[PDB]
Amino acid sequence: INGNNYVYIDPTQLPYDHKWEFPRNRLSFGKTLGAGAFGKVVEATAYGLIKSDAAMTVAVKMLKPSAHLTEREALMSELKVLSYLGNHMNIVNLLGACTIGGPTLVITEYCCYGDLLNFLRRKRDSEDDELALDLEDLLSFSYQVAKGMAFLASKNCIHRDLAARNILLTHGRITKICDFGLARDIKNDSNYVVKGNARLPVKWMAPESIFNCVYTFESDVWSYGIFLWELFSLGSSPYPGMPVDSKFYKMIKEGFRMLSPEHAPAEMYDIMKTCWDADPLKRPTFKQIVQLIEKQISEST
Amino acid sequence: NNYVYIDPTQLPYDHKWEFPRNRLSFGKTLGAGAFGKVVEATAYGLIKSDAAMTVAVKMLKPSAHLTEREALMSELKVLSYLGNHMNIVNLLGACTIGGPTLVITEYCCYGDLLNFLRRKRMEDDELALDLEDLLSFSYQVAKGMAFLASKNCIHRDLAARNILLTHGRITKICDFGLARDIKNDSNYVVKGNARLPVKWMAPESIFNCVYTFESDVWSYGIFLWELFSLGSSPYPGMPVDSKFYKMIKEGFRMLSPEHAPAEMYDIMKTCWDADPLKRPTFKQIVQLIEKQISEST
Numbered sequence: 001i002n003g004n005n006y007v008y009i010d011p012t013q014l015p016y017d018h019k020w021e022f023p024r025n026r027l028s029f030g031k032t033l034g035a036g037a038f039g040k041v042v043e044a045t046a047y048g049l050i051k052s053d054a055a056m057t058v059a060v061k062m063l064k065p066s067a068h069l070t071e072r073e074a075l076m077s078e079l080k081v082l083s084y085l086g087n088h089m090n091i092v093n094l095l096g097a098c099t100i101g102g103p104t105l106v107i108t109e110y111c112c113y114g115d116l117l118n119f120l121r122r123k124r125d126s127e128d129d130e131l132a133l134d135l136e137d138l139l140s141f142s143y144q145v146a147k148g149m150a151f152l153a154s155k156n157c158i159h160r161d162l163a164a165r166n167i168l169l170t171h172g173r174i175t176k177i178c179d180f181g182l183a184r185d186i187k188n189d190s191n192y193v194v195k196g197n198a199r200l201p202v203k204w205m206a207p208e209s210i211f212n213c214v215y216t217f218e219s220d221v222w223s224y225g226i227f228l229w230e231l232f233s234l235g236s237s238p239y240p241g242m243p244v245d246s247k248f249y250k251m252i253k254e255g256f257r258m259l260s261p262e263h264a265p266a267e268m269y270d271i272m273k274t275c276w277d278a279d280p281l282k283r284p285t286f287k288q289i290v291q292l293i294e295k296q297i298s299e300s301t
Numbered sequence: 302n303n304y305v306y307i308d309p310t311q312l313p314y315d316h317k318w319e320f321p322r323n324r325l326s327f328g329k330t331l332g333a334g335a336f337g338k339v340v341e342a343t344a345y346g347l348i349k350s351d352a353a354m355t356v357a358v359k360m361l362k363p364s365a366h367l368t369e370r371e372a373l374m375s376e377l378k379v380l381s382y383l384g385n386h387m388n389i390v391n392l393l394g395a396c397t398i399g400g401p402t403l404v405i406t407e408y409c410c411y412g413d414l415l416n417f418l419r420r421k422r423m424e425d426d427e428l429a430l431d432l433e434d435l436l437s438f439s440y441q442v443a444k445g446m447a448f449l450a451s452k453n454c455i456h457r458d459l460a461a462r463n464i465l466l467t468h469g470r471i472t473k474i475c476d477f478g479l480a481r482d483i484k485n486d487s488n489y490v491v492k493g494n495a496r497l498p499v500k501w502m503a504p505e506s507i508f509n510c511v512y513t514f515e516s517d518v519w520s521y522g523i524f525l526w527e528l529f530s531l532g533s534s535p536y537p538g539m540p541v542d543s544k545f546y547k548m549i550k551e552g553f554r555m556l557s558p559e560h561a562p563a564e565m566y567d568i569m570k571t572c573w574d575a576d577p578l579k580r581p582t583f584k585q586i587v588q589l590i591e592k593q594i595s596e597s598t
């Protein structure tokens with residue numbers, strides 16, 4: 001009933017606080033975790049970031065020399081976003097930043113097990129206690145990601161690229177929503193398709209985003225549905241055996257949708273299908289998804 | 302450590318645990334020995350009267366004699382005295398009226414850790430996450446045993462076969478006791494008039510079958526060995542014979558499992574000290590493992 005659903009925070013018109021500033025000379029860079037044309041996240045050690053005595057593993061997002069103005073402003077707005085979100089268990093959390101003394105460096109938590117997609121596909125490489133425990137993990141991942149997106153929505157942020165490749169897994173099997181953004185080489189990732197002037201994750205995108213470039217809280221919900229499908233498919237790409245071409249676009253428009261993964265619980269597939277309503281007003285909110293999944297987890301115990 | 306116990310015949314039965322026998326719907330047999338079995342059940346109105354809950358029930362077969370019936374009642378009294386802990390199988394209720402004793406506890410949905418460890422098969426991330434699980438199980442069992450000794454309770458048969466795994470990879474210490482077929486389990490060896498888990502027992506316990514808090518710490522060390530070796534049985538290629546007993550007395554100890562962190566093998570080695578007074582308590586082990594997990598982040 002709220003007006004909060006019709007408004008988003010514009011990261012441009014957001015403000016950076018200097019509590020985060022941290023001396024870049026006390027960073028020891030390590031292995032590169034991800035890289036695209038203009039950007040990279042690198043694993044690093046931060047000395048005295050939390051307790052003045054102890055070093056600490058972190059992740060640092062930075063740009064390559066190849067980057068021009070528009071990426072410099074994008075990294076700034078992302079640093080502002082991260083600063084404005086604060087802390088949630090299921091989002092990558094900002095820890096600090098270096099905007100003086102050189103190029104922008106965005107300092108956040110490091111997730112030690114990488115992205116969920118590669119986790120799922122290693123599992124894919126293969127009644128039963130082991131299958132039950134694996135199903136319990138996937139239920140947990142779907143719950144944690146719904147809670148993290150609910151938090152994002154409550155702060156009026158739209159993710160725009162929700163997918164298993166943008167979910168990180170860390171100690172305790174905690175999942176954190178991230179956005180590799182410029183630190184992903186989308187040119188060589190075939191999940192990103194040329195559409196007009198841009199390279200877009202078409203198979204995760206709601207029809208309003210594909211045909212009208214409309215992004216809203218409810219188009220994030222559509223992407224969440226695709227994520228559940230790849231989650232319960234152990235990371236196979238959506239609409240398998242099907243290129244993104246004119247036939248794909250016509251098929252989404254005419255109302256074809258994916259069948260359930262074999263080992264998706266019926267109620268999780270029910271959520272998926274409501275996420276894929278062509279009418280955004282009929283999709284559940286993330287707050288609603290969280291409510292439904294909690295019931296599923298509680299009944300499972 | 303203390304050196305005192307209370308025997309179960311001196312503990313009470315709080316009849317607030319009483320549950321109507323007619324509300325159990327018995328399911329698959331979880332484990333059975335000669336005189337007793339544990340079966341999965343549905344209990345209606347056990348925590349709140351609205352709906353039901355999956356539980357586990359330990360009971361005796363018609364074969365049981367008076368001594369097994371006393372033992373089950375004694376087990377019930379111990380679980381009542383113990384109280385609740387996250388890393389113990391907890392009492393939920395009991396049937397003692399109108400029929401034989403039924404002891405109702407939590408059902409652990411993934412079975413015992415030994416079978417879980419043995420069913421295993423690798424990229425670095427998968428290795429790391431498996432190691433994180435093994436450290437967690439180490440910590441959780443040490444916390445559970447820390448709780449047992451704080452209640453002056455001695456387990457006597459701590460082993461991976463007596464650790465259960467359930468939702469969230471929470472481990473619960475249990476004891477199938479009479480619900481294990483110990484004559485057909487080669488990990489229990491004839492010793493005098495009993496079949497005993499001699500490979501898990503401390504040397505000092507073998508003389509007169511005396512169990513202590515420090516011999517539980519010895520068994521925990523053996524447990525760590527089967528944990529980090531993914532469930533292989535201890536002292537490979539060494540049957541329990543005259544030479545086994547001799548070799549332990551002379552000081553022979555198991556080498557480290559290949560995937561044990563050197564700090565966890567150091568714990569094992571202190572657990573196997575020939576002088577029980579030099580072994581760590583479980584409280585100290587909990588503190589040591591807390592540090593290891595904390596640094597791993």
Ligand SMILES: CCc1cc(NC(=O)Nc2ccc(-c3cnc(Nc4cc(N5C=CN(CC)C=C5)ncn4)s3)cc2)no1
Pocket residue numbers: 033034041059060061078081082085091092108109110111112113114115152159168177178179180425426
């Ligand atoms: C609210 C949404 C949002 C996001 C955003 N920006 C935003 O997240 N940037 C951003 C910041 C930080 C990160 C990362 C943090 N930790 C990471 N760890 C790994 C580990 C890994 N391994 C692979 C393999 N192995 C052993 C073989 C170990 C590790 N591979 C790849 N990454 S990557 C990602 C993105 N702004 O808003």
Ligand SMILES: CCc1cc(NC(=O)Nc2ccc(-c3cnc(Nc4cc(N5C=CN(CC)C=C5)ncn4)s3)cc2)no1
Pocket residue numbers: 127128129331332339357358359376379380383389390406407408409410411412413449456465474475476477
């Ligand atoms: C404080 C120390 C102490 C303990 C004590 N007594 C004491 O523990 N009794 C006692 C009570 C309860 C239990 C059990 C509780 N849940 C259990 N679940 C399973 C599940 C399972 N599965 C196998 C396979 N599959 C695939 C279909 C699924 C499941 N297999 C075996 N068991 S067994 C054990 C013993 N007294 O003192």
